[PDB]
């Protein structure tokens, strides 16, 4: 963790003497829990003023980075009892005032995992301590999962062995010389610390992996589709829009808690009910990129279940049924209005096009719809990633692509495939040699005359 901050210039532990002097200024005013409630309602008061259009979309995103980066200064300095006396309790941050449940648990998650790993008699204290949830409805949700989903981080769901040891060969690799006895004392003292932290990660990872399986017998017993529907909007999608580190968590947890027969029911529901056009409208620049990071780890985690593992043959087509909906959902969004529904659409496609090429037909659809709005109207310089994105969609267009290898039943499309095969037999008779003059329509024009139907 500390080495990753060293690469993105996140100097926290470097200046700990400077940052702890600054935090003491906010405590003598007795105003740490006054800044947080002020920076929150000023983010909601910006949904009341009307001065401009695009800047009020940025000022809503700028008061979100300022509130997130203020919490990270509180957690770094106020450690122990000082955190308890400054920050208000969890019971009346949801009752007197009204903060939201993504924001309420973000402050009070490090403290509720340090006390749970301190004593086991404190385990009965905090989970009884709960206030009224007026934001989301607890009438047919299971609190055995609603509290369980909001309590866990990515620290006890994912585990790796590779990146722990990729620093070990690299540190002793570059440091091979005679420079001091003190640094060789410290480089060895750095190697010993990865090893103790790796095995203590496995202690906490194993106690959580058995914890869900003792509860997974309960959850996959009452599968109401409306009970999945309450699970989807109230806890899953507010955690994905929040932060990139909390978007990966909602991807990993859904494959570890639920079973694969029920897992095909829930991810079908997010695809089938067309909400992806309405999601990408009401998001900012940052909140659209996190929803891309959630989908790029579902489709990557599904094609490890198709290539190595086995899907059923109708279930393999059910994978491609989701492929045909998502392109129709985004092309209707790629042609929409002045700035919002086009800025989110290109930002969504910058992450997901790692695993884009599954269908040969669908990439030429989204590639040509980039070329139509550069002819219709241009207000700002939106082209500067659009000039970049058109190449990386074209360079991966020709790698490996087939629809007919993975879809078997094509009632009209195979009968279309007999049509599109014979017309290519005539054009190579037309171009190299010549017997009969016959000029036909090229690929680009029959797409657009089909796409004007697909837009409408």
């Amino acid at each position: 963790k500390q080495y990753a901050r060293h690469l993105i210039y996140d100097f926290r532990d470097d200046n700990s003497v400077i940052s702890s002097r600054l935090t003491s200024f906010f405590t003598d005013q007795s105003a740490i829990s006054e800044i947080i409630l002020l920076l929150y309602t000023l983010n909601l008061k910006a949904n009341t003023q009307n001065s401009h259009y695009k800047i009020l979309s940025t000022r809503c995103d700028e008061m979100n980075t300022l509130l997130w980066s203020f919490i990270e200064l509180i957690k770094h300095c106020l450690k122990g009892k000082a955190f308890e006396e400054n920050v208000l309790p969890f019971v009346e941050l949801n009752n007197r005032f009204h903060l939201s449940t993504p924001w309420t648990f973000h402050i009070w998650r490090d403290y509720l995992d340090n006390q749970l790993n301190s004593n086991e008699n404190f385990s009965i204290d905090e989970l009884i301590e709960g206030a009224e949830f007026s934001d989301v409805d607890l009438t047919k949700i299971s609190k055995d999962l609603f509290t369980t989903f909001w309590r866990l981080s990515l620290y006890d769901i994912h585990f790796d062995k590779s990146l722990y040891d990729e620093r070990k060969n690299a540190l002793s690799g570059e440091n091979t010389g005679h420079m001091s006895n003190r640094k060789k004392h410290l480089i060895q003292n750095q190697i010993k610390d990865i090893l103790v932290t790796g095995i203590s990660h496995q202690r906490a990872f194993k106690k959580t992996s058995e914890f869900i399986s003792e509860k997974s017998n309960v959850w996959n017993k009452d599968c109401g589709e409306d009970q999945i529907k309450i699970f989807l909007q109230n806890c899953v999608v507010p955690r994905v829009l929040f932060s990139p580190s909390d978007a990966l968590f909602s991807s990993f947890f859904i494959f570890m808690a639920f079973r694969t027969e029920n897992l095909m029911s829930i991810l079908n529901t997010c695809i089938t009910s067309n909400i992806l056009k309405t999601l990408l409208f009401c998001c900012t620049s940052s909140e659209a990129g996190n929803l891309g990071l959630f989908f790029t780890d579902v489709l990557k985690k599904l094609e490890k279940m198709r290539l190595n593992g086995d899907f059923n043959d109708q279930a393999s087509r059910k994978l491609y049924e989701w492929h045909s909906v998502i392109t129709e959902q985004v092309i209707d969004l790629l042609s929409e209005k002045n700035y919002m529904s086009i800025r989110n659409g290109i930002e969504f496609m910058k992450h997901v096009t790692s695993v884009f090429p599954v269908v040969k037909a669908h990439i030429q659809l989204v590639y040509t719809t980039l070329e139509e709005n550069l002819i219709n109207e241009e207000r700002e310089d939106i082209k500067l990633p659009s000039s970049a994105l058109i190449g990386h969609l074209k360079a991966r267009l020709k790698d490996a692509l087939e629809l007919d290898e993975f879809c078997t039943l094509t009632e009209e499309e195979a009968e279309q495939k007999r049509i599109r095969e014979m017309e290519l037999e005539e054009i190579k008779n037309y171009e190299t040699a010549c017997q009969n003059e016959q000029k036909q329509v090229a690929l680009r024009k029959q797409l657009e005359l089909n796409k004007s139907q697909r837009l409408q």
């Binding site: 949904n47 909007q233 999608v237 409208f281």
Partner: protein, 42 residues
């Protein structure tokens, strides 16, 4: 609930930026429908 109550007064009786300022608050309870309830997606 008042935000839907203004819709129940509007039917019985800029624009897009005010529309974006009412769908960012209705993504808590009434998220799953999102079809044509307040107005038309276009």
């Amino acid at each position: 609930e008042a935000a839907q109550a203004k819709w129940e007064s509007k039917i019985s009786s800029d624009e897009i930026i005010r529309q974006w300022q009412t769908l960012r608050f209705l993504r808590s309870r009434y998220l799953f429908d999102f079809d044509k309830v307040n107005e038309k997606t276009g």
